[PDB]
Symmetry: C3
């Protein structure tokens, strides 16, 4: 399309919401291509990641880890207004894995504190994709400080299974998984710092061990549990988008499955089916579609169980509805 043709397309301003929730959108595109507008303000802030009060100096898109999920449809244009407040101390930018050219946009969006930029790219490929800050010379540090999220580029006709039958979800959640590398002192205690740059050297040494001290969802151990457990009901169809910008993960819904899983996160690649545990390589997003059939509490984890239960990679789903004895029943309850 020409510059004139793009200029004539309708524009739609979207208001982002904090993960794991996802902003309002329509699965099947309502109309022709549009320029979908988003704005995100970058916030460098301290976040507490465990119950021991361990801190991380987060580099957060929109003030959250992960950054919010942006939803558009194939061949719409995504126009991001990115803002770096004068209150921040570092230059930041953004690389959309969904975009084509200039390092995903990173090369055209480098803004110092007190600056902003507007980047527009055509969402030519359908799927879920990671986005993350990538300042030259400081790439992994930015990413493992939490500056990453994902976007979903839906097919204009919504999702479909491998045979073309439509797959329509009732709810959608976005789980951003983060590997953190927190320095420790000689007594095995996590260190705290008064400035982001103060922890750089120490953090890089831990990063080089390729062994995270924490692996969490939505920025902290137990974040998506209790007041933040995700919800659903028996019979409801749920899409779970999961991203990991720097390290591999293997999601698993304990007590359920991934009925259809686009493990590579790309919708033109047929989804795997009846999955117990799927795999998403570091640097990517994936999506699983599941219809709940049993009520109760479910855990959703990275299935290296040490990472899930020792390091923090576990979330919960509270599901309502009637129990199905045909699917599962306790013939004899635990007894002598």
């Amino acid at each position: 399309a020409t510059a004139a043709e793009i200029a004539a397309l309708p524009r739609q301003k979207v208001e982002l919401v904090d993960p794991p929730f996802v902003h309002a959108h329509s699965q099947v595109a309502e109309g022709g291509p549009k320029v979908v507008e988003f704005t995100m303000v970058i916030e460098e802030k301290k976040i507490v990641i465990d119950d021991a009060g361990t801190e991380v100096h987060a580099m957060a898109f929109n003030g959250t880890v992960p950054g919010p999920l942006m939803v558009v449809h194939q061949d719409d244009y995504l126009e991001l207004t990115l803002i770096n407040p004068e209150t921040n101390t570092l230059m930041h930018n953004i690389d959309f894995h969904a975009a084509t050219g200039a390092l995903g946009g990173g090369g055209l969006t480098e803004i110092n504190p007190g600056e902003k930029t507007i980047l527009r790219f055509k969402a030519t490929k359908p799927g879920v994709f990671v986005y993350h800050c990538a300042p030259p010379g400081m790439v992994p540090w930015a990413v493992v400080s939490g500056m990453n999220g994902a976007i979903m580029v839906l097919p204009r006709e919504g999702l479909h299974d491998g045979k073309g039958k439509a797959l329509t979800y009732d709810k959608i959640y976005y789980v951003g998984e983060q590997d953190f590398y927190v320095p420790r002192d000689e007594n095995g205690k996590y260190k705290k710092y008064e400035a982001p740059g103060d922890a750089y050297e120490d953090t890089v040494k831990v990063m080089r061990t390729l062994t995270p001290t924490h692996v969490v969802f939505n920025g902290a151990v137990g974040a998506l549990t209790g007041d933040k457990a995700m919800t659903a009901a028996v019979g409801e169809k749920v899409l779970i988008v999961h991203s990991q910008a720097n390290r591999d993960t293997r999601p698993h819904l304990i007590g359920g499955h991934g009925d259809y899983v686009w493990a590579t996160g790309k919708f033109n690649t047929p989804p795997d089916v009846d999955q117990e545990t799927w795999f998403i390589p570091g640097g990517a997003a994936g999506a699983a579609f599941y219809t709940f059939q049993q009520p109760g509490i479910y855990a959703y984890v990275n299935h290296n169980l040490i990472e899930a239960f020792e390091l923090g990679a576990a979330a919960h789903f509270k599901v309502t509805g009637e129990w199905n004895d045909d699917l599962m029943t306790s013939v004899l309850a635990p007894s002598g």
Copy 2:
């Protein structure tokens, strides 16, 4: 199906056999849906995992690491009587990744020493699936102490390739891969403990490094070698089921291939073909089908070669038959 309909179904009691062998079964289902009955007694026991004599306090289903492979067909019911003898010291349960609800059955099977329980679930999805103990609060420790295995839910019409052609194996083996985390003393020598509880803290510290000290098949370095090597003949079709309940693995048959590999372990997901090395993420089972074409000794390994040859993840196949010089021939033997 109603309670009445299920109660009317025929029942078949199956006797389990120790891995890598698999109990007798039919690839194509004989008759309509059945309630297939299995019984397993849990044994907390000391096992030796290497030639030096390293000991692990194993938590073992049916007394073996991995637990035995249970085989049923899609839409049969798997009814497990699980027994935790009073001689044990910990509470145990079972999570079948093939099951739907109550954390895979984990929430309905918590039995203390001196108790038993009978769980029944409908095997609604075809494929190989991991099962493992998961006591709230000590999940990874239970699993990396060996309390995991797998089941196979065969399609009622047996296996087929991705295009509808029948794939009938002549024999099947179940390779359970286990990552162990054994504490060491200041000399770098593995420690031994009186009771399993004594090793908990030291073991959790090793687990947190995400670096196992041993990665083995059938519970110990070299377990599937020598007089315990697997066997086949030129022309024989073999299905190799492989599971890893906690950590990724990348199986490879040295000297062969994976002709058809359901890398995700799910039979409704078309298998990859002509594989050199496949990948099974932690928390899943996979299966590879191969027709041997050359005689001789083969090694079957996790292809991170350090894990295979330094940590223990290597098995052997002894294969009888005639050498095929068309497929391979030494034109010039090693010479000056």
Copy 3:
């Protein structure tokens, strides 16, 4: 085929070229099945792998890390003359994952210094496959010392997408990724050794941590960046063959995608499409086809960003051509 028919096939000698470049070949097979002859001399040599003068005693097929890409077509035979000069100190051999029997050829090619051997095998399965040295008892050390490469067995009719449409590349590159494990003294300085054998004990200790000190492309940090960046032009179709003989990797083209990716490296397995980041397990090769659409400098990395930017797994592509503002444009450049 009869013995006479095999003997009657044409024999063709091919001159190899050093990675990342690939020797002359045709995508669609020219003529019928042939015995393609290659010769490689093994070189044990000290190489510097980083900007701090760190050394490794490389075990190098044809003198390079990785060894060169050999290209044949399905049902051709690959006949390799392998030479181990008397000036080397170790026994070497070769295991072609593309081959069937005798541990991929390793059991028939064990040559001591001063010996040579000629192995012939029929390339029955299409795809890119790893090859590597595998001396019994020292397999991982040989592989992680750089003695590995890959071959490509093209379908006789060239490559095709999942719908059968032809995929013809304009350029092809081979990126071999190597995990190195270099010993350090108590001060953290990498150690140097007089002879290869001298480093064995110390190196295996580093290998058991499963944590590489360096992860590089083409044998050294920065080998494929700067003036050694790979090249392309907007509109050009490029095939990127990538291998990792011992450890997992997750390739990503920063600013681009993998339009068609045979992630398992096998051409009879349909390629994934529109990939952001693909996954190649240790012990395998994969291939990605992409048509460049934007000019500029691109980075191609292992997307565990710590491995890419701290450990060395980052390459560059320098692409010429006209910028496409439809695909991407800076609506508002970075400004106050």
